[PDB]
Design a protein around this ligand. Structure first.
Ligand code: HEM
Ligand code: HEM
Ligand SMILES: N=C(Nc1ccc(CCNCc2cccc(Cl)c2)cc1)c1cccs1
Ligand SMILES: N=C(Nc1ccc(CCNCc2cccc(Cl)c2)cc1)c1cccs1
Ligand SMILES: C[C@H](O)[C@H](O)[C@H]1CNc2nc(N)[nH]c(=O)c2N1
Ligand SMILES: C[C@H](O)[C@H](O)[C@H]1CNc2nc(N)[nH]c(=O)c2N1
Ligand SMILES: [Zn+2]
Lengths: 419, 419
């Protein structure tokens, strides 16, 4: 039957039944738990080589179709059976099917709604879908992406959107965005061992340069897009600087802050994930939403593996920077989140603090349970990198399963690409 | 073979082989992950009813014995085989065996070393073992416990120790400490719905009163012990107030702090867990170590389900207590951890900040891997309730398995007790 789940802060108990509809085996073994593994194969969907077997495509297809029409308040039996027949023919005749633009909008919000590591899923039904399935060239991809960045950025009033490029076929003509985020900074590795810019993109940065891009060697050089259409080699496209919106970080109290010289783009859009729906796969479909404070303040700026500015901020706060026990890091990182949240609102770019996010998620989780008796949640990712216990999510038990549709990771294109 | 595991902050990768020696199935299913479930049956060892089958006792016994002698630098083949034979006879003849005091010391440190949710395991080999197996009465249990509290408290210079009361037998004459922590406060529920003291002990508190204890209705009334010897009903014993050491909390800056009227015992000792070694079970064996700041400051004082003083501390800090986005909680809880860490050191009681703890654990994890290619770690518990990302553990992948010996949870004695 169900799986009992409890929140220790409110004592409220829940029953998770939805997991019953999970696809394959997840990351965990019967006798061992690998829930802290970041990039597990259970969460990845790699390179295809031939069409996907009709035997398995048709089953999945019927599954989705049924799920779609099931979404409806008071169904359309006629319509439902009609499309059911209509899709089978197509598969039989063509080898694959196509989703009605509406079924794709449904597919994109469900895949989101089913993302265990997302804390903003309360917004799941507010998604702008840009159908670019008819696309055929890098030049065209680039245009669609510019349209998206402009729409999504909304002069600062962020809007959630996703651009759905062509579905995969034989897997030999895949559409891919070699980037990992539409807008992101470059990571260079100065001769003297030093790493300047964003260490997390050191490797991708290199490739870009290897593809003709000109390295401007600086902490905030926005990388160019690296588009791949119909499975051809990639082409490098510079984004119109007028389209990239950045926030200059400044502290509502510490004016010494500006001197740190810290800015950060205002649009968070993942460009390297695969949408899976009804047995179909779209290896290229960038999507955005808005930021949650901590993403920038705590992880981007403080991670030692990222911009690592936690000591500098402390020194400039005149803190016992050599006495771990003093809790100076707890002091630093917080003022830093204050700069980040204030620097966004000041300039009026949509931003969301982590206490509120953590809160809307419980509301969402409450709905998902009354709605469909279940909500795939990855506790490790859903809990903020700061304030753990201080947030309601922390005291909430969850179950983490992969349903369908879903947003999978993929393998670095430059790794599985026949040039 | 091994399971690849990586730290994202240092990039250093590891191979976990030790998991191969895991006992039974853990909390997770092939297709679903229940890693955030607190009290899973995979981590619990309940009431026994008859002796444990010789068929399964002997196998486990040989297992441990072999493991013990294996601990030795340059083995004692003779001795090893001798004890191997010696134990089998005993089991054959008596129905169970007894551990040489030395094998028990080894058993207590390994069970600790194998506790996935412990962040201080670097200290695993420093454990004081108090052999009370010969015990037979509540009066005797009470004495042993007083000896332990006095030794462990060490006038403030905390010392790690464990008292091993009689092993289980037919399960009908079990030794149990109905408490959950040697020293702890009481939770009363004032007529007017109010809860005063420590909400977490509301239920246990009641029982105590139900057993004759006199409710002194106050935020810090230390509960009496509730001892059960040879499987008889429990008897209530007041702890000598001279043995309980408490720290009065005060802020090294905010003198308004004292007015909060906050103190907390200085000895953290779990009294309700079961030690499992060589197929044997000791349902009664309290053990202690010292505190990690956050345990008190973040969880005990702030949890809404505990003492919940996070708003009050903020008001008294003159913070935008009605603007979640202001990050006032991040501000509060930190100063509170500063009061807690400073109030302990001032009075000279051993305390440990969470950044250092999180650090020694990585060192430990590094050793456990070079030592035995594995370390059962429960990421969710090992990561602090504050400063998540700011600590090295956060960026460390881990595997969580139950080995042997091990410290299991048990079922509330008052639930499975034939009065
Ligand atoms: C509306 C605002 C949104 C907020 C505030 C939000 C917030 C978050 C946060 C904080 C993460 C953490 C990423 C990291 O730490 O690396 C995340 C991940 C994710 N979100 Fe959302 N999200 C939002 C919208 C969306 C949208 C529009 C989609 C897709 C349609 C989405 C899909 C996901 C997925 C799949 C992940 C997992 C990424 C990964 O595993 O690498 N989110 N989200
Ligand atoms: C030396 C200092 C030690 C420190 C600083 C330490 C710290 C911790 C912390 C912070 C917890 C978290 C408990 C909670 O959040 O509820 C914990 C749990 C635990 N520790 Fe340690 N520990 C220490 C010593 C020991 C000792 C001496 C033993 C046993 C011989 C031990 C066995 C465990 C076990 C089994 C748990 C799990 C408790 C549970 O699951 O409820 N620890 N420890
Ligand atoms: N708030 C967001 N921020 C955000 C979301 C996803 C990511 C991706 C981070 N994952 C890193 C990673 C590591 C390894 C492989 C892959 Cl595919 C991806 C980053 C910021 C939003 C993203 C999309 C909508 S909102
Ligand atoms: N630092 C410590 N603190 C500490 C350790 C364990 C616990 C137990 C908390 N577990 C709660 C719980 C909940 C449900 C069932 C059981 Cl058995 C136990 C509390 C503080 C030490 C404990 C023992 C040595 S040190
Ligand atoms: C090892 C562990 O899985 C890893 O550090 C996770 C923890 N939680 C996270 N949570 C979010 N939101 N994002 C991350 O990148 C991570 N990293
Ligand atoms: C639901 C979740 O497992 C639960 O809140 C856990 C999280 N991590 C924890 N970590 C420690 N050390 N102690 C706890 O009590 C908890 N509670
Ligand atoms: Zn798991």
């Amino acid at each position: 039957q169900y799986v009992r789940i409890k929140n220790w802060g409110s004592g409220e108990i829940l029953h998770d039944t939805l997991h019953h509809k999970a696809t394959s085996d997840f990351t965990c073994k019967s006798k061992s738990c690998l829930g802290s593994i970041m990039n597990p194969k259970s969460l990845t969907r790699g390179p295809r080589d031939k069409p996907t077997p009709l035997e398995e495509l048709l089953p999945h297809a019927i599954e989705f179709i049924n799920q779609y029409y099931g979404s409806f308040k008071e169904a359309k039996i006629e319509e439902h059976l009609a499309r059911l027949e209509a899709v089978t023919k197509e598969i039989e005749t063509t080898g694959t099917y196509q989703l009605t633009l509406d079924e794709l909008i449904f597919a994109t919000k469900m895949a989101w709604r089913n993302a265990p590591r997302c804390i903003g899923r309360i917004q799941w039904s507010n998604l702008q879908v840009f159908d670019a399935r008819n696309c055929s060239t890098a030049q065209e991809m680039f245009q669609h992406i510019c349209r998206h960045i402009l729409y999504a950025t909304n002069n600062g009033n962020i809007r959630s959107a996703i651009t759905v490029f062509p579905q995969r076929s034989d897997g030999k003509h895949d559409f891919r965005l070699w980037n990992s985020q539409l807008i992101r900074y470059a990571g260079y590795q100065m001769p003297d061992g030093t790493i300047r810019g964003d260490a997390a993109t050191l490797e991708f940065t290199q490739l870009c340069i290897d593809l003709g891009w000109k390295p401007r060697y600086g902490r905030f050089d926005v990388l160019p897009l690296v588009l791949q259409a119909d499975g051809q080699d990639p082409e490098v496209f510079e984004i119109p600087p007028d389209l990239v919106l950045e926030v200059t970080m400044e502290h509502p109290k510490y004016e010494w802050f500006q001197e740190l010289g810290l800015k950060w783009y205002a649009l968070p859009a993942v460009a390297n994930m695969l949408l899976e729906v009804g047995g179909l796969e779209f290896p290229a479909c960038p999507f955005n939403g808005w930021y949650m404070g901590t993403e920038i303040g705590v992880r981007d700026f403080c991670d030692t593996q990222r911009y690592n500015i936690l000591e500098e901020v402390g020194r400039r706060m005149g803190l016992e920077t050599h006495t771990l026990a003093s809790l100076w890091k707890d002091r630093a990182v917080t003022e830093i989140n204050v700069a980040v949240l204030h620097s966004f609102q000041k300039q009026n770019v949509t931003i969301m603090d982590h206490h509120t996010a953590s809160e809307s998620f419980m509301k969402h989780m409450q709905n998902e349970y009354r709605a469909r008796g279940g909500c795939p949640a990855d506790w490790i990712w859903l809990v903020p990198p700061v304030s753990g216990s201080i947030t309601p999510v922390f005291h909430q038990e969850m179950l983490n399963y992969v349903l369908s549709p879903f947003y999978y990771y993929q393998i670095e294109p430059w790794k599985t690409h026949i040039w």
